């Protein structure tokens, strides 16, 4: 084996550079190195709150991405358009890193390496696809078994359970994959206290965080997805008021332009998988936020070429 190796058993910037190129060229990280990454990142993630709370100083910026769904070559394109992660260039990836796209292993191990290299400046939040039920149907479980083993898949499932469920920037912007709640009165402290190391329940706030969607009319509706609900602009306004927040940023729905701003400004969708499943034809975006001005700035981008492997090839 002549591929990327850890230095004195730890990730370094020179290792991360070697790995992205290794993967671009369709090569596999040695199982021993993938193991060390998974055990080290479980350790780091298991120490974090369910609600990650981040302060951005007035000269600091952060980038927010939505669903990536194993589109590794579009992930590389984000880093080329927007720069490598670093202490001065932090990132948040907002769930659904795996499933649907056929380079989910490359996406998740690159994201984990950067989490290890920059633990205070590189942030991962759980999506509805970081779960067993979903991985078993939509491709990730099949992909890991094909490249590694069932055992390695079990380790991934365990690591995913330690992903935090939401992130609050400067006590003003709350970020989750799905959205708000099926009941009125949920608070930030309620989120902090969720015992998250598990597969999510069929109902309740951990379910809602990963699964809900906005609707335009006031009220709530039963979801067409069969779990959680659709929430109206009355629900969003009430939640922001109680928790002294400005707005929310969520993902979980494909948008033709890469983003959407619903509820009069209060409920932003960001989606980071362009030409989703090689079929949608949609643009993607990421958001920039700055400590001195937390209003979202949208940066759009389009799909780049990838090797000839079809979506869901491992599903
Ligand atoms: C179809 C999708 C998925 O299965 O995750 C994929 C396309 C939009 C969004 O991401 C989606 C609806 C989601 O469930 O989060
Ligand atoms: Zn989703
Ligand atoms: Zn998704």
Of 147, 243, 140, give the one whose Cα is nearest residue 190. Answer: 243
Structure tokens at 255: 């948008």
Q: Are strands 61-65 and 91-94 parallel, antiparallel or unpaired?
A: parallel
Strand partners of residue 288? 63, 297
Of 95, 96, 90, give the one whose Cα is nearest residue 122. Answer: 90
Of 44, 69, 194, 178, give the one whose Cα is nearest residue 121. Answer: 44
Beta-carbon count within 10 A of 152 CB: 17
Q: Ligand 3: distance of its center to the CA of 208 in Å?
A: 14
Of 27, 53, 54, 51, give the one whose Cα is nearest residue 109. Answer: 27
Q: Which atom of ligand 1 is the closest one to the Cα of 129? A: 5
Rounded distance between C-alpha atoms, residue 26 and residue 176, angstroms:
32
Ligand 1 atom 3, closest CA = 252
Q: Does the active-site annotation cover 123? A: no
What is the experimental resolution, given in Å to one decimal place?
1.6
SS (H, E, C) the chain: CCCCCCECCECCHHHHHHHHHHHHCCCCCCHHHHHHHHHHHHHHHHCCCCEEEECCCCCCEEEEECCCCCCHHHHHHHHHHHCCCECCECEEEECCCCCCCCCHHHHHHHHHHHHHHCCCCEEEECCCCCCHHHHHHHCHHHHHHHHCCHHHHHHHHHHHCCCCCEEEECCCEEECCCCCCCCCCCCHHHHHHCCCCCCCCCCCHHHHHHHCEECCCCCEEECCCCCCEEECHHHHHHHHHHHCCCEEEECCCCCCCCEEEEHHHCEEEECCCCCHHHCCCCCEEEEEEECCEEEEEEEEECCCCCCCCCCCCCC
Contact 258, 283 (CB under 8 A): yes
Rounded distance between C-alpha atoms, residue 235 and residue 38, angstroms:
38
Helices 104-117 + 31-46 axis angle, to 10: 60
Q: Which mutation among 95, 100, 130, 250 tests ligand 1's pocket best, with the greatest number of atoms within 8 A of CB?
A: 100
Structure tokens at 303: 């799909």
Rounded distance between C-alpha atoms, residue 51 and residue 174, angstroms:
9
Task: Please name the residue that has the structure tokens 């002294």.
Answer: 244
Q: Ligand 2: distance of its center to the CA of 225 in Å?
A: 11
Q: Annotated catalytic residue: which of 129, 288, 299, 306?
A: 129
Of 153, 85, 84, 152, give the one whose Cα is nearest residue 118. Answer: 85
Residues sharing a CB contact under 8 Å with residue 223, sequence separation 6 or more, in sequence order: 211, 212, 213, 229, 230
Of 158, 105, 112, 110, give the one whose Cα is nearest residue 131. Answer: 158
Q: Ligand 3: distance of its center to the CA of 274 in Å?
A: 12
Instruction: Please name which ligand lies nearest the alpha carbon of 97.
Output: 3
Cβ < 6 A, ligand 1 pocket: 67, 96, 128-129, 252-254, 276
Q: Which atom of ligand 1 is the closest one to the Cα of 251? A: 15
Where are the chain's structural domains? 1-315
Contact 64, 175 (CB under 8 A): yes
Q: Ligand 2: distance of its center to the CA of 5 in Å?
A: 33
Q: Ligand 2: distance of its center to the CA of 85 in Å?
A: 24
Is domain 1-315 annotated with CATH 3.60.21.10? yes
Residues sharing a CB contact under 8 Å with residue 101, sequence separation 6 or more, in sequence order: 68, 69, 70, 71, 72, 107, 139, 273, 277, 311
Q: How far is CA 204 from the centre of its chain?
A: 21
Helices 72-82 + 104-117 axis angle, to 10: 40
Structure tokens at 126: 């759980």
Ligand 1 atom 13, closest CA = 252
Angle at Cα 39 formed by Cα 34 and Cα 41, nearest 5°?
Answer: 90
CA dihedral 46→106→94→154, nearest 10 degrees, is -40
Q: Which mutation among 66, 70, 96, 274 tests ligand 1's pocket best, with the greatest number of atoms within 8 A of CB?
A: 96
Residues sharing a CB contact under 8 Å with residue 73, sequence separation 6 or more, in sequence order: 24, 103, 304, 305, 306, 307
Q: Which mutation among 65, 66, 67 tests ligand 1's pocket best, with the greatest number of atoms within 8 A of CB?
A: 67
Contact 205, 190 (CB under 8 A): yes
């Amino acid at each position: 084996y002549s591929g990327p190796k850890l230095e004195d058993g730890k990730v370094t910037i020179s290792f991360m550079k070697e790995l992205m190129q290794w993967y671009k060229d369709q090569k596999k990280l040695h199982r021993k190195c993938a193991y060390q990454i998974l055990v080290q990142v479980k350790e780091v993630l298991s120490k974090l709150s369910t609600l990650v709370e981040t302060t951005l100083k007035e000269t600091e910026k952060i980038t927010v991405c939505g669903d990536t769904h194993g589109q590794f070559y579009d992930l590389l394109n984000i880093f080329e358009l927007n720069g490598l992660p670093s202490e001065t260039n932090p990132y948040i990836f907002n769930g659904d890193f795996v499933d649907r796209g056929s380079f989910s292993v490359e996406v998740i191990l690159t994201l984990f390496g950067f989490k290890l290299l920059y633990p205070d400046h590189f942030h991962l939040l759980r999506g509805n696809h970081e779960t067993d039920n979903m991985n078993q149907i939509y491709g990730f479980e099949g992909e890991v078994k094909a490249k590694y083993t069932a055992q390695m898949y079990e380790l991934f499932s365990e690591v995913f359970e330690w992903l935090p469920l939401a992130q609050c920037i400067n006590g003003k912007v709350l970020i989750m994959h799905g959205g708000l709640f099926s009941e009125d009165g949920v608070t930030l402290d309620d989120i902090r206290k969720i015992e998250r190391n598990r597969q999510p329940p069929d109902s309740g706030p951990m379910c809602d965080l990963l699964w809900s969607d906005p609707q335009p009319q006031n009220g709530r509706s039963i979801s067409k997805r069969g779990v959680s609900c659709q929430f109206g602009p009355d629900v969003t306004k009430a939640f922001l008021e109680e928790n002294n927040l400005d707005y929310i940023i969520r993902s979980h729905e494909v948008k033709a332009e890469g983003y959407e701003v619903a509820h009069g400004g209060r409920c932003v969708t960001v989606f980071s998988a362009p030409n989703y499943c090689d079929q949608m034809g949609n643009k993607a975006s990421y958001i920039h936020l700055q400590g001195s001005d937390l209003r979202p700035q949208f940066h759009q981008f389009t799909a780049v070429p990838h090797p000839n492997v079809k979506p869901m090839a491992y599903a």
